Design an enzyme around this catalytic site. Structure first.
Site, mmCIF file in Angstrom:
data_model
loop_
_atom_site.group_PDB
_atom_site.id
_atom_site.type_symbol
_atom_site.label_atom_id
_atom_site.label_comp_id
_atom_site.label_asym_id
_atom_site.label_seq_id
_atom_site.Cartn_x
_atom_site.Cartn_y
_atom_site.Cartn_z
ATOM 1 N N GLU A 52 44.184 43.195 52.786
ATOM 2 C CA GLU A 52 43.067 44.077 52.561
ATOM 3 C C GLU A 52 42.220 43.604 51.272
ATOM 4 N N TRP A 103 46.943 56.551 46.209
ATOM 5 C CA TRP A 103 46.423 56.225 47.594
ATOM 6 C C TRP A 103 47.446 55.223 48.497
ATOM 7 N N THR A 114 41.884 28.890 45.367
ATOM 8 C CA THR A 114 40.975 29.476 44.903
ATOM 9 C C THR A 114 40.304 28.969 43.715
ATOM 10 N N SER A 173 27.901 31.952 47.540
ATOM 11 C CA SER A 173 27.598 30.407 47.768
ATOM 12 C C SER A 173 25.828 30.476 48.061
ATOM 13 N N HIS A 175 55.283 41.264 46.410
ATOM 14 C CA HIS A 175 54.873 41.142 44.908
ATOM 15 C C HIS A 175 54.677 42.320 44.292
ATOM 16 N N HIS A 176 54.507 43.364 45.225
ATOM 17 C CA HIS A 176 54.181 44.497 44.822
ATOM 18 C C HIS A 176 55.454 45.520 45.071
ATOM 19 N N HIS A 207 47.945 43.717 50.768
ATOM 20 C CA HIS A 207 47.295 42.622 50.215
ATOM 21 C C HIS A 207 46.424 41.991 51.110
ATOM 22 N N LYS A 261 37.199 26.559 45.151
ATOM 23 C CA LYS A 261 36.241 27.113 45.184
ATOM 24 C C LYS A 261 35.483 27.624 43.797
ATOM 25 N N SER A 277 37.046 52.080 63.116
ATOM 26 C CA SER A 277 35.752 51.761 62.552
ATOM 27 C C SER A 277 36.017 50.056 62.418
ATOM 28 N N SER A 278 37.000 49.868 61.422
ATOM 29 C CA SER A 278 36.978 48.321 60.967
ATOM 30 C C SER A 278 37.462 47.477 62.236
ATOM 31 N N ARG A 291 50.868 54.384 34.141
ATOM 32 C CA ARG A 291 49.888 54.615 34.971
ATOM 33 C C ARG A 291 50.160 56.088 35.679
ATOM 34 N N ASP A 318 21.052 39.939 69.591
ATOM 35 C CA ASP A 318 21.612 41.449 69.262
ATOM 36 C C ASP A 318 23.179 40.924 68.830
ATOM 37 N N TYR A 339 41.762 40.793 50.160
ATOM 38 C CA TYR A 339 41.094 39.633 50.609
ATOM 39 C C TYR A 339 40.147 40.048 51.599
ATOM 40 N N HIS A 342 39.181 59.067 44.650
ATOM 41 C CA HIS A 342 38.577 58.240 43.811
ATOM 42 C C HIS A 342 38.841 56.797 44.628
HETATM 43 C C1 HEA Z 1 36.323 49.731 45.062
HETATM 44 C C2 HEA Z 1 37.352 49.695 44.225
HETATM 45 C C3 HEA Z 1 37.187 50.411 42.657
HETATM 46 C C4 HEA Z 1 36.110 50.571 41.791
HETATM 47 C C5 HEA Z 1 34.839 50.164 41.976
HETATM 48 C C6 HEA Z 1 36.517 51.343 40.686
HETATM 49 C C7 HEA Z 1 35.917 51.644 39.598
HETATM 50 C C8 HEA Z 1 36.244 52.349 38.612
HETATM 51 N N1 HEA Z 1 37.622 52.679 38.451
HETATM 52 FE FE1 HEA Z 1 39.142 52.604 39.699
HETATM 53 N N2 HEA Z 1 40.510 52.390 40.742
HETATM 54 C C9 HEA Z 1 40.671 51.863 42.045
HETATM 55 C C10 HEA Z 1 39.448 51.065 42.552
HETATM 56 C C11 HEA Z 1 38.411 50.950 41.997
HETATM 57 N N3 HEA Z 1 37.727 51.620 41.115
HETATM 58 C C12 HEA Z 1 41.907 51.756 42.532
HETATM 59 C C13 HEA Z 1 42.621 51.350 44.007
HETATM 60 C C14 HEA Z 1 42.733 52.742 41.812
HETATM 61 C C15 HEA Z 1 44.356 53.096 41.963
HETATM 62 C C16 HEA Z 1 44.686 54.295 42.512
HETATM 63 C C17 HEA Z 1 45.886 54.709 42.219
HETATM 64 O O1 HEA Z 1 46.276 54.582 41.190
HETATM 65 O O2 HEA Z 1 46.453 55.210 43.266
HETATM 66 C C18 HEA Z 1 41.662 53.038 40.546
HETATM 67 C C19 HEA Z 1 42.369 53.597 39.848
HETATM 68 C C20 HEA Z 1 41.423 53.973 38.632
HETATM 69 C C21 HEA Z 1 42.084 54.634 37.439
HETATM 70 C C22 HEA Z 1 43.744 55.060 37.302
HETATM 71 C C23 HEA Z 1 43.848 56.577 37.143
HETATM 72 C C24 HEA Z 1 45.362 56.828 36.898
HETATM 73 O O3 HEA Z 1 46.175 55.943 37.182
HETATM 74 O O4 HEA Z 1 45.600 58.067 37.350
HETATM 75 C C25 HEA Z 1 41.121 54.626 36.331
HETATM 76 C C26 HEA Z 1 41.245 55.339 35.127
HETATM 77 O O5 HEA Z 1 40.331 55.281 34.552
HETATM 78 C C27 HEA Z 1 39.934 54.097 37.078
HETATM 79 C C28 HEA Z 1 38.622 53.817 36.742
HETATM 80 C C29 HEA Z 1 37.539 53.332 37.235
HETATM 81 C C30 HEA Z 1 36.575 53.250 36.457
HETATM 82 C C31 HEA Z 1 35.961 53.973 35.108
HETATM 83 C C32 HEA Z 1 35.360 52.511 37.424
HETATM 84 C C33 HEA Z 1 34.038 52.231 36.915
HETATM 85 O O6 HEA Z 1 34.165 51.543 36.069
HETATM 86 C C34 HEA Z 1 33.183 51.866 38.121
HETATM 87 C C35 HEA Z 1 32.072 51.064 37.198
HETATM 88 C C36 HEA Z 1 30.837 50.526 38.085
HETATM 89 C C37 HEA Z 1 30.363 51.340 39.107
HETATM 90 C C38 HEA Z 1 29.679 52.472 38.458
HETATM 91 C C39 HEA Z 1 30.215 51.178 40.507
HETATM 92 C C40 HEA Z 1 29.041 50.777 41.117
HETATM 93 C C41 HEA Z 1 28.281 51.891 41.818
HETATM 94 C C42 HEA Z 1 27.669 51.813 43.119
HETATM 95 C C43 HEA Z 1 27.531 53.128 44.081
HETATM 96 C C44 HEA Z 1 27.523 50.661 43.629
HETATM 97 C C45 HEA Z 1 26.113 50.481 44.527
HETATM 98 C C46 HEA Z 1 25.714 49.075 45.021
HETATM 99 C C47 HEA Z 1 24.962 48.930 45.774
HETATM 100 C C48 HEA Z 1 24.671 49.580 47.017
HETATM 101 C C49 HEA Z 1 24.163 47.324 45.719
HETATM 102 N N4 HEA Z 1 40.053 53.519 38.202
HETATM 103 C C1 HEA Z 2 39.648 42.281 45.140
HETATM 104 C C2 HEA Z 2 40.893 42.434 44.903
HETATM 105 C C3 HEA Z 2 42.010 41.849 44.293
HETATM 106 C C4 HEA Z 2 42.055 40.081 44.298
HETATM 107 C C5 HEA Z 2 41.043 39.134 44.647
HETATM 108 C C6 HEA Z 2 43.409 40.195 43.808
HETATM 109 C C7 HEA Z 2 43.912 38.731 43.496
HETATM 110 C C8 HEA Z 2 45.441 38.553 42.787
HETATM 111 N N1 HEA Z 2 46.241 39.229 42.698
HETATM 112 FE FE1 HEA Z 2 46.041 41.428 42.789
HETATM 113 N N2 HEA Z 2 45.692 43.450 43.028
HETATM 114 C C9 HEA Z 2 44.731 44.191 43.311
HETATM 115 C C10 HEA Z 2 43.427 43.620 43.907
HETATM 116 C C11 HEA Z 2 43.270 42.265 43.980
HETATM 117 N N3 HEA Z 2 44.169 41.243 43.415
HETATM 118 C C12 HEA Z 2 44.906 45.578 43.321
HETATM 119 C C13 HEA Z 2 44.020 46.788 43.927
HETATM 120 C C14 HEA Z 2 46.337 45.864 42.882
HETATM 121 C C15 HEA Z 2 47.077 47.013 42.550
HETATM 122 C C16 HEA Z 2 47.435 47.534 43.796
HETATM 123 C C17 HEA Z 2 47.985 49.241 43.522
HETATM 124 O O1 HEA Z 2 48.880 48.950 43.048
HETATM 125 O O2 HEA Z 2 47.375 50.087 43.664
HETATM 126 C C18 HEA Z 2 46.834 44.457 42.798
HETATM 127 C C19 HEA Z 2 48.275 44.256 42.173
HETATM 128 C C20 HEA Z 2 48.394 42.831 41.941
HETATM 129 C C21 HEA Z 2 50.177 42.647 41.969
HETATM 130 C C22 HEA Z 2 51.163 43.679 41.937
HETATM 131 C C23 HEA Z 2 51.732 43.963 40.729
HETATM 132 C C24 HEA Z 2 52.185 45.256 40.407
HETATM 133 O O3 HEA Z 2 51.736 46.005 41.169
HETATM 134 O O4 HEA Z 2 52.944 45.485 39.545
HETATM 135 C C25 HEA Z 2 50.053 41.158 41.672
HETATM 136 C C26 HEA Z 2 51.782 40.615 41.681
HETATM 137 O O5 HEA Z 2 51.571 39.194 41.619
HETATM 138 C C27 HEA Z 2 48.806 40.520 41.873
HETATM 139 C C28 HEA Z 2 48.456 39.176 41.651
HETATM 140 C C29 HEA Z 2 47.228 38.423 42.257
HETATM 141 C C30 HEA Z 2 47.071 36.984 42.288
HETATM 142 C C31 HEA Z 2 48.070 35.869 41.725
HETATM 143 C C32 HEA Z 2 45.568 36.976 42.625
HETATM 144 C C33 HEA Z 2 45.124 35.544 42.891
HETATM 145 O O6 HEA Z 2 44.321 35.333 44.090
HETATM 146 C C34 HEA Z 2 44.015 35.045 41.707
HETATM 147 C C35 HEA Z 2 43.648 33.697 41.850
HETATM 148 C C36 HEA Z 2 42.569 33.531 41.098
HETATM 149 C C37 HEA Z 2 42.533 32.633 40.043
HETATM 150 C C38 HEA Z 2 44.089 32.255 39.424
HETATM 151 C C39 HEA Z 2 41.430 32.405 39.202
HETATM 152 C C40 HEA Z 2 40.574 31.051 39.314
HETATM 153 C C41 HEA Z 2 41.672 29.679 39.533
HETATM 154 C C42 HEA Z 2 41.401 28.613 38.590
HETATM 155 C C43 HEA Z 2 40.321 28.609 37.995
HETATM 156 C C44 HEA Z 2 42.503 27.618 38.902
HETATM 157 C C45 HEA Z 2 43.138 27.114 37.666
HETATM 158 C C46 HEA Z 2 44.214 28.046 37.128
HETATM 159 C C47 HEA Z 2 45.754 27.630 37.062
HETATM 160 C C48 HEA Z 2 46.172 26.270 36.860
HETATM 161 C C49 HEA Z 2 46.773 28.671 36.596
HETATM 162 N N4 HEA Z 2 47.755 41.542 41.679
HETATM 163 CU CU CU Z 3 48.680 41.829 46.341
#
Ligand code: HEA
Ligand code: HEA
Ligand code: CU
Ligand code: PCF
Ligand code: PEF
Ligand code: PEF
Ligand code: PEF
Ligand code: PEF
Ligand code: PEF
Ligand code: PEF
Ligand code: PEF
Ligand code: PEF
Ligand code: PEF
Ligand code: CA
Lengths: 133, 51, 59, 102, 45, 534
Positions: F243, F127, F316, F256, F290-291, F241, F319, F157-158, F438, F92, F245, F62
């Site tokens: 990734e 993953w 952030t 925008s 932080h992970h 991380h 923006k 690829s990337s 989880r 191109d 971003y 998934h």
């Molecule tokens: C791209 C990132 C992404 C997206 C979109 C989703 C979408 C969803 N994810 Fe998941 N998820 C992850 C990234 C993502 N997830 C990751 C990294 C983990 C952790 C893996 C790990 O634990 O090892 C995770 C884990 C995770 C778990 C944890 C399972 C466990 O811990 O064992 C669950 C449980 O319900 C879950 C649920 C869902 C659900 C219900 C949706 C659905 O809600 C989706 C809702 C919306 C859609 C249906 C998608 C849109 C459809 C498209 C095809 C887009 C097409 C668009 C155009 C081309 C214009 N996700």
């Molecule tokens: C699109 C993907 C995406 C983005 C953008 C982010 C954004 C951020 N993430 Fe996240 N993160 C994930 C994807 C993402 N993350 C995934 C996939 C995991 C789990 C990985 C795994 O275990 O599989 C994860 C897990 C993860 C962890 C590890 C936790 C754990 O595993 O136990 C942490 C730790 O600090 C973190 C923090 C943050 C913070 C601080 C931001 C910040 O950038 C957010 C900043 C944004 C705002 C703050 C909002 C707007 C701000 C304002 C309006 C300003 C005013 C606010 C104040 C004064 C407070 N997230």
């Molecule tokens: Cu992170």
């Protein structure tokens, strides 16, 4: 310029008739009203005045709105019909799932609470496990 | 190389002037995508002896 | 010797694809395509055993 | 951009006198109503006399319609209709409420 | 001076209805799980 | 026909192949998340017959499909390859044959990951693929090898595509366009291309070293030879991380354009938007541990990473306030792309505020492997990056294709995914704060309540995806009719107040980028005499 007014049969209700008029007949009305606007404006008639305002700023062509009348109600009906279909489909797939766990009963859950009340579980936020029938 | 221009010319699949309906291609393509997780489950549940 | 100018006029007045214009290009392209087919088909003919858990008896 | 209100009127008065067709009168009018202010009565008078010179009545009607959107109260709309009384009467311009009365 | 009514009265008439419409939307977005628990067996028996 | 689509050197044709593969992959990754949510509906064995290895296999499949086979080939491989050369006047890309190999490695990486789930028992590792669970003692056979080779092929690829994006932007701009004059979407693909170039090679070191432990008798991470499992996590998260971003910034540039078009106002403080995108891309290399807050690092190491993680909230938030400043005082037009952009501003803020709590190391003790984390990253990835992907398709596909879509059908689709996504992920925070781990197929009985609610919303959102598949069919069969009846929107900008209907027909388009000035389906030879700006 062309001085004589446009006849009432020509521009009577321009807003209502504009959309169905043939195109070549639309161009002819525009040509004659352009020569008429070169005269002093106190001479022009009301149907002539309402035509020139409508053709410039009327709610047609470019000024067509994003949603037509009756579209928001189609949208609210389509969302409520999509919620009903998905929820009723979930309840059909659930009927192919596996049996309940042996502990998901009120009788079993009330002896759990017997054990937790002795051990003084959660002394200010509650320990009860009863969620079943 | 010189190619053609127009509406249905910048895509790899044919939509018009075909014998078979385009619905069989459009929804057959997205059906196979939705169906690969279930093929995997079938193979693995047939290995554990569940079936 | 120098053959840049002579090959320059052969290449620029040819209708064939780029990888076919040199007079010597038949000797590379014919055997490569045959070898390329064996190297792609043969690994695919082994996934059925891998799913079925049969291992080669190199013993 | 540090332009005082007095410099605003003296610049758009000059800009309405140079407009030479309908595209120019509508483009200058669009930019004049796009600031955070209501143009002065002496600017509205020059915009009416510019649409007369290109012979277009709907553009002169829309001038007063934009005026009733931009003001803050309905007593600010009235005080404009009481300053530009002769000009709306001398050129023969009606109000959109007077033309399509409800 | 200033023509018309005070800017406080004009702005008050426009925002007061919107404060109540904001609080009725954010309550639905954040409080909808409270309704699920209301009709549950676990709640209040 | 064969040589137009198998031998291609045109950047527009290649971008169409990317989108075709990207959408075929979101089908599979959505089907896996549906099977996952059915097995979590209630306590006990439900549909998988107690096979816990199979449940773990579907979770890896998934995540890999959603990230590496949907969101990256569509936001970058698709929109980047199609709109970046057109927005700067390029005829191109640089290196057109490199541009083609970076697509054809993704089909081969899919017939490596799919055959990984069918061989022996699959890879039930997560993953992140931590050792020693992923070494040959705890995972025998060829399944984890075939998953590593799949990840290797997505890195080729990337990386190759990033080198091409960087050279094209710096070398092939048109007459008068300087780096301060680039559109904001071009800046977002340029900065993303640099993060990929400096983070992918560290991941290729980590997972090739994991392949060596399994098959070549090596002790990078094996504890009996002196190796250390905690080394792998440093190497994996130093790519991780950056990734996340690499997945949000291209969506920052899409948001925008959409917000500015449907406000009739230019982006507020456009120059400080580029400075913020660069600061977030730089601070995303200094926060990776932080992970790893609970693996036993020093207390002074943990206090540094707390403050480093928090300060990415300042750029952030600039923006976020900037986007609210351009729509203030606007003339808003509520077409379908504008609906997604307004939902992005509300749902991305929520997901980012739960990240600020996670940023403190003291509080992360109650937030490790907790559903609370799963709730954080589905708000910023599925109501974030996914919502910006819908906003893009509805914004550019009528031009790219020459075919319009049913407007009122598209607003039903938007409301069905907005309602259904919130139902899945909002209760995930309640489960986590009460202590639910989880990566489990089964749980204690006190967690049954919110787990049932989330499984219902999973059916609502899959129905919204099936409506999108029909909208594609309707646009491709009835697209020309959608222009003459009143079933679609023709102009994304309407006449100004004092602009008459016929004056508006002199200049229908008022655009600050080239792409809306081309023919509807753009010509295969788009520029002969170069475009010129002042
Ligand atoms: C791209 C990132 C992404 C997206 C979109 C989703 C979408 C969803 N994810 Fe998941 N998820 C992850 C990234 C993502 N997830 C990751 C990294 C983990 C952790 C893996 C790990 O634990 O090892 C995770 C884990 C995770 C778990 C944890 C399972 C466990 O811990 O064992 C669950 C449980 O319900 C879950 C649920 C869902 C659900 C219900 C949706 C659905 O809600 C989706 C809702 C919306 C859609 C249906 C998608 C849109 C459809 C498209 C095809 C887009 C097409 C668009 C155009 C081309 C214009 N996700
Ligand atoms: C699109 C993907 C995406 C983005 C953008 C982010 C954004 C951020 N993430 Fe996240 N993160 C994930 C994807 C993402 N993350 C995934 C996939 C995991 C789990 C990985 C795994 O275990 O599989 C994860 C897990 C993860 C962890 C590890 C936790 C754990 O595993 O136990 C942490 C730790 O600090 C973190 C923090 C943050 C913070 C601080 C931001 C910040 O950038 C957010 C900043 C944004 C705002 C703050 C909002 C707007 C701000 C304002 C309006 C300003 C005013 C606010 C104040 C004064 C407070 N997230
Ligand atoms: Cu992170
Ligand atoms: C205005 C605010 C918002 C307004 C709010 C709107 C949303 C409100 C949502 C409330 C509805 C929630 C209901 C939840 C679904 C449900 O409760 O199903 C009940 C049971 C299955 O529920 P279960 O407890 O999980 O089943 C147990 C599994 N066993 C042990 C059977 C193997 O199902 C059964 O077995 C018996 C029922 C069989 C199904 C028939 C019911 C009707 C379905 C007809 C099918 C139509 C569509 C399918 C087309 C093919
Ligand atoms: C939000 C809480 C509940 C959400 C879940 C349930 C959603 C309701 C179900 C679907 C409603 C269908 C209504 C029909 C369409 C309609 O209303 O159209 C009426 C108007 C204009 O059309 P008109 O009337 O002028 O012309 C009608 C011609 N036939 O469009 C709108 O205003 C759309 C509003 C846009 C909102 C943007 C996205 C909102 C999510 C962002 C979060 C909001 C901030 C939260 C914090 C305050
Ligand atoms: C499932 C995916 C969601 C698909 C949404 C579109 C169809 C929803 C039904 C709908 O919107 O029905 C709305 C229309 C009524 O509106 P109208 O046709 O008079 O048009 C003018 C707008 N008032 O009734 C129909 O269409 C005919 C019957 C459709 C089936 C209704 C299903 C109810 C159960
Ligand atoms: C199965 C039918 C066989 C019929 C037997 C032939 C008898 C004569 C019938 C005539 C039909 C000829 C069949 C030829 C095959 C065919 O035309 O459609 C068959 C094609 C398959 O082929 P493919 O070339 O796409 O490659 C792919 C093979 N793996 O389906 C499809 O892709 C359907 C795909 C549609 C979904 C894509 C939607 C994307 C829209 C573009 C938007 C882009 C946005 C970009 C933004 C960056
Ligand atoms: C799909 C593979 C096609 C790659 C292109 C190619 O193999 O090339 C196509 C070449 C020749 O065609 P040509 O393009 O060299 O032009 C020639 C102009 N006179 O035939 C082959 O190789 C045949 C190889 C057999 C393919 C079987 C393996 C398929 C996997
Ligand atoms: C922003 C998006 C917001 C969208 C709004 C959500 C609505 C979409 C549908 C949600 C699915 C409902 C899941 C029910 C699961 C279930 O089966 O519930 C079971 C419970 C009983 O519990 P049990 O233990 O007996 O279960 C036994 C298991 N077999 O019965 C119910 O409570 C009925 C549902 C109550 C209806 C509330 C729906 C929410 C609407 C909110 C309205 C505004 C409230 C404002 C409060 C301040
Ligand atoms: C598993 C073992 C690892 C194998 C590595 C993967 C192998 C994939 C590529 C196979 C090599 C075929 C040659 C293609 C390259 C080429 O030809 O570069 C030549 C290109 C041709 O430019 P053009 O034709 O596009 O433009 C037409 C103009 N005449 O010049 C450039 O771009 C200039 C920049 C050179 C950069 C080349 C980078 C090297 C590619 C490999 C990168 C691998 C990174 C990952 C490292 C592990
Ligand atoms: C752009 C490039 C960004 C470069 C990243 C450098 C920033 C480091 C800040 C945190 C340092 C710290 O403070 O780390 C403190 C910790 C202490 O660990 P401990 O608690 O176990 O000490 C307990 C003592 N017994 O050392 C580490 O973890 C090692 C991390 C070093 C980082 C190496 C980066 C090398 C980059 C190679 C990739 C090139 C591409
Ligand atoms: C304390 C934390 C505050 C956080 C606020 C975040 C709120 C986010 C919502 C932003 C929407 C409003 C957009 C800004 C309005 C604007 O456009 O302001 C820009 C305009 C343009 O002035 P000018 O260029 O014409 O003249 C030249 C000016 N140097 O000047 C104003 O109007 C002044 C605004 C008042 C100052 C704010 C006082 C706060 C107390
Ligand atoms: C569920 C089906 C329920 C029937 C609803 C009938 C709609 C009434 C109507 O006929 O509505 C007419 C509209 C045209 O819209 P209109 O604006 O022209 O008419 C309105 C006048 N005011 O067509 C539709 O809505 C079609 C609705 C299709 C719904 C989804 C179709 C199936 C999608 C899932 C399958 C694809 C995935 C497969 C791949 C895995
Ligand atoms: Ca279960």
């Amino acid at each position: 310029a062309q001085t004589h007014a446009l006849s009432n049969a020509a521009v009577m209700d321009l807003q209502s008739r504009w959309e169905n008029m043939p195109s070549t007949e639309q161009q002819d009305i525009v040509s004659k009203l352009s020569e008429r606007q070169k005269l002093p404006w106190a001479q022009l008639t009301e149907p002539e005045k309402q035509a020139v305002w409508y053709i410039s700023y009327g709610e047609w062509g470019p000024r067509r709105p994003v949603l037509n009348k009756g579209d928001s109600s189609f949208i609210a009906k389509g969302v409520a019909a999509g919620l009903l279909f998905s929820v009723g489909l979930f309840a059909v797939v659930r009927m192919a799932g596996g049996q309940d766990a042996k502990t998901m009963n009120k009788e079993w859950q009330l002896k759990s609470d017997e054990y937790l009340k002795s051990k003084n579980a959660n002394p200010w936020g509650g320990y009860s496990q009863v969620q079943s029938k | 190389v010189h190619f053609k221009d127009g509406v249905y010319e910048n895509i790899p699949f044919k939509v018009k002037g075909r014998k078979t309906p385009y619905a069989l291609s459009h929804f057959g393509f997205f059906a196979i995508g939705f169906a690969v997780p279930f093929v995997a489950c079938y193979v693995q549940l047939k290995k554990s002896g569940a079936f | 010797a120098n053959k840049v100018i002579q090959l320059q006029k052969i290449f620029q007045s040819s209708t064939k694809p780029l990888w076919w214009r040199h007079p010597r290009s038949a000797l590379y392209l014919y055997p490569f395509y045959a070898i390329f087919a064996v190297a792609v088909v043969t690994p695919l003919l082994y996934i059925p055993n891998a799913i079925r858990g049969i291992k080669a008896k190199k013993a | 951009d540090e332009e005082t209100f007095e410099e605003f009127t003296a610049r758009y008065e000059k800009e309405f006198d140079e407009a030479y067709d309908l595209f120019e009168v509508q483009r200058v009018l669009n930019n004049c109503f796009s600031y955070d202010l209501v143009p002065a009565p002496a600017v509205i008078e020059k915009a009416l006399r510019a649409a007369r010179r290109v012979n277009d009545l709907p553009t002169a009607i829309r001038v007063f319609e934009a005026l009733k959107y931009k003001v803050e109260n309905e007593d600010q709309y009235k005080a404009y209709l009481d300053e530009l009384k002769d000009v709306r009467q001398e050129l023969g311009v009606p109000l959109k409420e007077e033309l399509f009365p409800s | 001076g200033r023509i018309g009514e005070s800017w406080v009265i004009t702005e008050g008439r426009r925002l007061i209805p919107e404060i109540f419409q904001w609080s009725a939307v954010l309550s639905v977005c954040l409080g909808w799980p409270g309704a699920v628990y209301f009709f549950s067996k676990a709640r209040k028996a | 026909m064969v040589q137009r689509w198998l031998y291609s050197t045109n950047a527009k044709d290649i971008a169409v192949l990317y989108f075709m593969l990207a959408i075929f992959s979101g089908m599979a990754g959505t089907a896996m998340s549906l099977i996952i949510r059915l097995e979590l509906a209630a306590p006990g064995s439900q549909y998988l017959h107690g096979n816990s290895q199979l449940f773990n296999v579907l979770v890896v499949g998934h995540a890999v499909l959603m990230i590496f086979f949907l969101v990256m080939p569509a936001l970058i491989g698709g929109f980047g390859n199609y709109l970046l050369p057109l927005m700067i006047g390029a005829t191109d890309t640089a290196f057109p044959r490199i541009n083609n190999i970076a697509f054809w490695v993704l089909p081969m990486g899919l017939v490596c990951l799919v055959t990984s789930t069918l061989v022996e028992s699959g890879a039930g590792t997560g993953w992140t693929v931590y050792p020693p669970l992923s070494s040959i003692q705890a995972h025998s056979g060829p399944s984890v090898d075939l998953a590593i080779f799949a990840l290797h092929l997505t890195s080729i690829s990337s990386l190759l595509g990033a080198i091409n994006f960087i050279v094209t932007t710096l070398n092939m701009r048109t007459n008068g366009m300087t780096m301060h004059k680039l559109p904001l979407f071009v800046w977002s693909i340029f900065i993303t291309a640099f993060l990929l170039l400096l983070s992918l090679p560290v991941l290729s070191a980590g997972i090739t070293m994991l392949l060596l432990d399994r098959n070549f008798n090596t002790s990078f991470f094996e504890v009996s030879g002196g190796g250390d499992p905690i080394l792998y996590e440093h190497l994996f998260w130093f790519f991780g991380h950056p990734e996340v971003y690499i997945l949000i910034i291209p969506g920052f540039g899409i948001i925008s354009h959409v917000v500015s078009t449907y406000s009739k106002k230019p982006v507020f403080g456009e120059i400080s938007m580029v400075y913020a995108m660069a600061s977030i891309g730089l601070l995303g290399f200094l926060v990776w541990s932080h992970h790893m807050y609970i693996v036993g690092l020093d207390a002074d190491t943990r206090a540094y990473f707390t403050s480093a993680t928090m300060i990415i909230a300042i750029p952030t938030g600039i923006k976020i306030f900037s986007w609210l400043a351009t729509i203030h005082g606007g003339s808003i037009r509520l077409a379908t792309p504008m609906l997604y952009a307004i939902a992005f501003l509300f749902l991305f803020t929520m997901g980012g505020l739960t990240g600020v709590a996670l940023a403190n190391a003291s509080l992360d003790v109650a937030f490790h492997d907790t559903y609370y984390v799963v709730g954080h990253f589905h708000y910023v990835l599925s109501m974030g990056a996914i919502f910006s992907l819908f906003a893009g398709y509805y914004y550019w596909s009528p031009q790219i294709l020459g075919l319009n879509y049913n407007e009122k059908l598209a607003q039903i689709q938007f409301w069905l995914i907005f309602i259904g996504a919130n139902v899945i992920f909002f209760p995930m925070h309640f489960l986590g704060i009460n202590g639910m781990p989880r990566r489990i197929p089964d749980y204690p009985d006190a967690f049954a309540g919110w787990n049932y609610v989330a499984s219902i919303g999973s059916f609502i959102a899959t129905l919204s995806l099936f409506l999108f598949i029909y909208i594609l069919y309707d646009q491709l069969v009835n697209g020309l009719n959608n222009k003459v009846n009143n079933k679609s929107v023709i102009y994304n900008k309407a006449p100004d107040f004092v602009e008459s209907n016929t004056i508006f027909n002199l200049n229908t388009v008022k655009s600050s980028s080239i792409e809306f000035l081309l023919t509807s389906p753009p010509a295969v030879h788009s520029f002969n005499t170069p475009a010129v700006q002042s």
